[PDB]
Amino acid sequence: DALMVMPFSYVLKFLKFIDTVMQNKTLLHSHLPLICKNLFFIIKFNHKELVSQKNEELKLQIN
Amino acid sequence: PVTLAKVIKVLGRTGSRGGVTQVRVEFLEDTSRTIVRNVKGPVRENDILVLMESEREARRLR
């Protein structure tokens, strides 16, 4: 419910956050299940808006 | 000019002020662009709302 309240603008900051976590692989394995659940619902909830954008920097982050 | 946005999700657990509902709407002009708003009257999904301003983002109104 907390994450559904999030506007799509804060999703992009969330995706950037998750990307930065990726480099810290120590933090990655420590909380891998949680990162999976929260990241992936977020894609679910506002998939339509996320796919809409043409932003190159977002395209490399998702990859 | 005033825009039209169709509600897609009535947000819950939001604790807005009594008689106020925090909701998510999608502009008719652009089916991609969504915005979160606050509504006064009773609301269901699939309605459409007339927005005077399209830039302000909803905040929990105490």
Binding site: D1, A2, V5, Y10 | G15, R60
Partner: peptide, 11 residues
């Protein structure tokens, strides 16, 4: 006080 999500937005 600030709730779940609202606290996150600040974070």
């Amino acid at each position: 006080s600030l709730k779940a999500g609202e606290r996150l937005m600040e974070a």
